[PDB]
Design a protein around this nucleic acid. Sequence first.
RNA 1: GAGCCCUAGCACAGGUGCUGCAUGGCCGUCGUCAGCUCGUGCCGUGAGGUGUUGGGUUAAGUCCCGCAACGAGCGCAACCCCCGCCGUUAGUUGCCAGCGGUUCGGCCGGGCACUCUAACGGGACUGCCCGCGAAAGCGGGAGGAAGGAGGGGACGACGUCUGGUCAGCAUGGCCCUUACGGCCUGGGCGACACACGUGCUACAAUGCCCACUACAAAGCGAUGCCACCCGGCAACGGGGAGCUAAUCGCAAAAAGGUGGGCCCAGUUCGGAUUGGGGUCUGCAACCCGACCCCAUGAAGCCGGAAUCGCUAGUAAUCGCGGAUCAGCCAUGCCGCG
Lengths: 98, 78, 24, 60, 127, 206, 155
Amino acid sequence: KIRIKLRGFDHKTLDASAQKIVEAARRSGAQVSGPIPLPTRVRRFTVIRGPFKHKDSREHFELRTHNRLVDIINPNRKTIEQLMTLDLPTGVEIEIKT
Amino acid sequence: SLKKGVFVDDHLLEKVLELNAKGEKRLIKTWSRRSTIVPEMVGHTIAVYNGKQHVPVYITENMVGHKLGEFAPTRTYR
Amino acid sequence: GKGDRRTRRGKIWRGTYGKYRPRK
Amino acid sequence: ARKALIEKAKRTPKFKVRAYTRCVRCGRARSVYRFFGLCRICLRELAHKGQLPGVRKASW
Amino acid sequence: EQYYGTGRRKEAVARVFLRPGNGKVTVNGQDFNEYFQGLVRAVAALEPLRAVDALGRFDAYITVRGGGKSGQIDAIKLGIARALVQYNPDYRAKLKPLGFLTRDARVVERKKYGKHKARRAPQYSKR
Amino acid sequence: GNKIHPIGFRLGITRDWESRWYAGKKQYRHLLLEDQRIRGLLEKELYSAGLARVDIERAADNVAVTVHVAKPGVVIGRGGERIRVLREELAKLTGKNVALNVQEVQNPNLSAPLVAQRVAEQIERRFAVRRAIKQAVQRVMESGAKGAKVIVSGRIGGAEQARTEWAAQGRVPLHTLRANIDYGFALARTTYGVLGVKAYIFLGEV
Amino acid sequence: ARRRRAEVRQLQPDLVYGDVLVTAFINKIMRDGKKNLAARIFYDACKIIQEKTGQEPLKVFKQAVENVKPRMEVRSRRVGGANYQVPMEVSPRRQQSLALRWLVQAANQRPERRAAVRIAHELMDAAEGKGGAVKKKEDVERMAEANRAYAHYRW
RNA sequence: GAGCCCUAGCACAGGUGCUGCAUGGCCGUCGUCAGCUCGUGCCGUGAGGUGUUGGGUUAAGUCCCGCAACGAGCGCAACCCCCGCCGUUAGUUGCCAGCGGUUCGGCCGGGCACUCUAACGGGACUGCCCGCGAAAGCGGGAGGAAGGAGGGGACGACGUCUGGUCAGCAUGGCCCUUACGGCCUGGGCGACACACGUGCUACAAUGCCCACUACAAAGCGAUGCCACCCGGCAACGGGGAGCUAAUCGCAAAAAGGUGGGCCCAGUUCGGAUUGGGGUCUGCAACCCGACCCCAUGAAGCCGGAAUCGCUAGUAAUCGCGGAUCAGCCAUGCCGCG
Ligand SMILES: [Mg+2]
Ligand SMILES: [Mg+2]
Ligand SMILES: [Mg+2]
Ligand SMILES: [Mg+2]
């Protein structure tokens, strides 16, 4: 039972990047428990638009950490093939656990 | 307001304790108005800076526990 | 109410806890 | 002064109380968002360029 | 044996489960009148029944979670209604007239900058 | 003074970031300060190349710098003795292993940040603003573009009175999100003061 | 209201007598959106109408209101000079608005310490037709008559 | 006399020194107002006009009909985000929903149904009916979570105010260069006879107090949140488990509901002011920190002339979080419900 966390600012290249990680584990391992979407940690910034004294009117900036999760029940190396380096994630991260 | 020391300045004490072997000087001028007036080292007169000058403050028993700044007021006509 | 340190309401408003509003 | 100052804010000083922030570009004291070492202006600036990643136009 | 409709109203969601026969109503492992204890309006949540005639003749087991009480009262009011249309496509033409069937979109409008409060605007002094 | 930065406005669609690397509260801050002083030195000692974008990707001790230009042969050297010194200037301050790709703009008259840069250039060589603007737009409009526009701010022709010339062609639907509008801002230090150049070029759709 | 006529906002029937007029009156009792506390009051007060008279509350209620509706009132008006209190017929929707508003105001003018009582005794004093609400209502009606001389300006 | 570092010179540094009326950039504003234009033709000696005007209609120069104009551009609308309904994908957050074991806490096997989480789609079009209309469209009815811009954002034309800012930054000029630079310690920005703006807390019984009583809705936390123990009336101090956090913590939601108290009083309203004892952060709390507990309990009984906000989940009212941040003078602001 290999279980993996994936963070990302980019909601597209996760459901993308870490869901090829479901082909290369059903095609090369056995049973998968599909992609699970963890709720998001949304850091927000509120910024006064002008250099000087314009306290009403500012603009809203968010920085949104998306969180996806993957479970597979197959600690063999018929899997750990693609699933070590066979890349398409460029602004992503990995948590590796069992 | 603390209870683990009386956060009084080294540079001042050093100068009082070392005056405490026959020492009766007025010429004593500090800048640490932040330092607590400490149990019994009284008799003397300390010139406390108010930001513009030091002030001849005589120090008595009834007035321990208080800081030095309390006796050297910093602003004018009040 | 909200102005009185020594009420429940006082404490809530002020953020604090104490004798007049404990932490259970 | 703002130089002898941009400089002084870099020395780890006697007592950490004296340790302040400073917009790392727009070399500046106030409204310094800690997650970016960035002054609210020199900040709205880079954000607009996309030179701070994931950072975006918020709207709800 | 079992019947379901989901109600929502403003952060609050209702799990409704209708069962045939009776009259009693659980909400969150608690009697109705124990959950909505002397809150004048609660008697409203079951008004969908009163309108069909199943005033009593149904049991109800209920989960209810989300923000706050008076919403939940309405949340249920939809569940109940939705649940019993899925025990009768013929339960349309009487429930829709009083429309216990419309979700009701009205949420907290959002706090805007420069205002104090979404619409309430700061205090002008002119002179 | 109204009007949003039309890149900022487009980051969701129609425009990606110039730093695509992930992180977290702990080192995002410096993965920025470094990240910048990079495109810092790059922009200065690479001007002659003429650099449009300068993307950056990361993944811990690697950093895929991708300097876009239209003069690639100026980043390079002879066989490669500039591009050699530079991948070495990068790792000089950056305690890291610096990948340093190069790209080319097939058409530098569709790269607003150059079009602006161009016009700025002319200005410092006491040129003729109204015309420069006039030409630049044309140049761009010539090379296949679906509309475009350029603004010089003020102190035109050394004038005591600051003013603001601008010319436009085709479309520039600045309110349409699905536009794809390269924007670029050239500066322009002159003997009597700064002017400011803004270039817009419209391409996209559906 | 420059564009439209604005729909008479439609109210949710009384969950206890089934009357829109009642909710209306409950709302006028309400302070800072404490609708719960408000209904307690109205009902506790209907309690105090049995406990004191033979007849049905909904009936005292309907009636108290009826007596408090004004039929004419003065509306102010611009003329070449200063202003004119111009008497004119008071529209049904407003009659209702004013009645309820006045009942609640008059109620909280009374001396008794607990709200449901005040509401009740005022409701009672009204159907009998002698509350301070029916007072500040004959004041209007009378005042529209005082000014009967200017009734040739009504728009 | 390679580099480095010292003292003596030198070229220079430095300047939050002046000019926003030399400037860039960015902002405010009329104003999300329904406008401002151009190309060609046409009319006029010409400035210019026509177009854009008119009649109908829109939230709109929105569209319709008409017309010496016919078309375009920056606007408006739409393309993006959030909130309503439904579907697909997906199972450490959902449950007896169904059954079994439950130390009776979804806790345990077990399942994703449902709730949710988050990605992607569907859905609304004046498409349908009746009436009026030449048309656009208007009024009404159906069905539908939603109906005629369903609700809230982001988004600010040509220009205007020689608006704002040289103290964020960039910059031309100008000016000081053992001092208009720099360093430190202390004071100041916290002064107080007065006067205004914006707020907070009240003046009470639709109220105040004390008790018991899950209805959760955004966000933050590994030099942190800190459960839970014990000491203390408490602030807080010991200890001390868990969480790189849909898993652990901040966290009590408060208004509410139930019970009891107060009984119309300057009060069991109100908590200013002052005396005292302490806690914490910090090198350090006199000037000048917040917090706890004892005492002290002020003006205030709803406010002259004036005057501000808001059209619906709005106003009113009740809490919750965050940014800066050692601590905090936040009753401020940005957000949640
Ligand atoms: Mg100006
Ligand atoms: Mg300017
Ligand atoms: Mg000025
Ligand atoms: Mg001026």
